[PDB]
Ligand binder design. Structure first.
Ligand SMILES: Nc1ncnc2c1ncn2[C@@H]1O[C@H](CSCC[C@H](N)C(=O)O)[C@@H](O)[C@H]1O
Ligand SMILES: Nc1ncnc2c1ncn2[C@@H]1O[C@H](CSCC[C@H](N)C(=O)O)[C@@H](O)[C@H]1O
Lengths: 239, 239
């Protein structure tokens, strides 16, 4: 029962992944658990402020360390009571390591994650220094909040958990091949005949050549780092 | 009034960005409009089918998406949009980044196609899709989260949505650490430059932090940065 806790000002945003699709069916079947913790539930004052003006001047607001520390402690206690051995705290940040398939595969082995979602101009650095084990970025772009990155990370993990993908792009270092389904003819374009109903073996051959050629056309640096089985090497030299 | 149309089996997911945060305030203020089109409203009610050649999973059918995309196109024309590309979210697309995001701001609006399951029929892409974009080298269970990532990244750079000049990747460097109250957190002080500094030495410190952080974490990005003479002077004043 993989345990996910997200520290977020907008818990309702996570309904996008707990209430729909394959990730929703996983939450509803209790294969995973998603608990949302709002730092405003650990803030002081009638307004429950979690943000304040940055030292050194500058626009915007910075999330205060003290409510987030309390929210992370609560999340740590929730995970311990859930039977988890250890759950690392991940901060979503453009300054973290870049999520890719290799990272996803490692995350699948974890008992669970606590994911910290920032807002405003970001989170006080001392909070990161003391409470965060890992920083991950979903890409070289800036979003208005860490909730969507958290959801991207969570979704990428949930779909590889047992009882929730062998042909995934990047799983073998190559891109997936073009897919075709009914109708037989679409706006003058037909399915390649090899795929239509030939035997099991020759369809598999075509799929590899398509993965390699597509990977070659779009992402040639991945061809540099790919390792081929002997059956695949045979197919290439034939062309 | 930028126009967004998303083709998605799960329109409710997009509440995550239209109802919360800065992107939500933009939708409520009518600075942007997001319209969801469900391919199930255009089927004869199946929208996915088994792939030719066998293989696991389902492939989204071209004909409902063609009808949905055309409806999206007429929706966009009736909104007055001149230039609206059809974008398909796919890990086989070009990788989104901040430079790409800036280019999207130039469009009158977007039609974004969200695939599910094993993906979208290849021929539908060939005939109806102008651009393919990936948010990263990992596989998600659907294109809705990537669509939202793209939309959020665009929305936060639109006029009337101050504090975006200091973003990561804006100048090719990562952002510097942020601090706010209290003066001391669990033994850690705010750097004194930020506490009691002034315009020149704070600006110097922030730049040296951006540079050093980029060098430690993303050393390839230093290759692609061009420095003002004042920044070049600041660096040499250290080394
Ligand atoms: N590409 C991305 N990957 C992961 N988290 C991201 C992200 N873009 C924004 N976020 C998170 O969204 C929140 C608000 S944006 C703050 C951005 C920060 N000044 C910077 O450029 O480093 C932060 O917690 C930030 O880490
Ligand atoms: N990194 C990413 N960027 C953009 N769209 C993505 C994505 N990961 C998944 N999607 C979209 O999510 C949907 C279901 S995932 C299908 C993935 C496909 N087998 C492949 O390996 O290429 C598809 O429409 C896909 O384009």
């Amino acid at each position: 029962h993989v345990f996910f806790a997200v520290i977020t000002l907008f818990p309702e945003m996570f309904d996008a992944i707990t209430a729909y699709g394959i990730s929703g069916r996983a939450a509803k079947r209790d294969i995973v658990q998603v608990t949302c913790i709002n730092p405003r539930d650990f803030a002081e004052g009638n307004y429950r402020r979690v943000d304040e003006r940055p030292f050194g001047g500058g626009p915007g607001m910075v999330m205060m360390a003290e409510p987030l520390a309390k929210a992370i402690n609560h999340a740590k206690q929730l995970a311990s009571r859930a039977g988890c051995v250890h759950v690392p705290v991940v901060y979503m940040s453009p300054q973290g390591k870049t999520l890719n398939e290799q990272a996803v595969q490692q995350f699948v082995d974890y008992d669970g994650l606590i994911v910290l979602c920032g807002r405003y101009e970001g989170v006080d650095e001392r909070l990161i220094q003391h409470y965060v084990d890992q920083e991950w970025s979903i890409g070289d772009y800036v979003l208005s909040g860490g909730e969507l990155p958290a959801m991207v990370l969570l979704d990428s993990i949930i779909r590889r958990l047992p009882n929730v993908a062998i042909q995934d792009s990047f799983v073998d270092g190559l891109l997936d091949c073009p897919q075709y389904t009914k109708p037989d003819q679409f706006e003058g374009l037909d399915v390649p005949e090899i795929l239509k109903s030939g035997h099991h073996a020759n369809i598999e051959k075509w799929r590899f050549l398509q993965r390699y050629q597509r990977t070659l056309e779009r992402r040639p640096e991945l061809i540099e780092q790919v390792t081929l089985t002997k059956q695949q090497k045979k197919w290439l030299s034939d062309e």
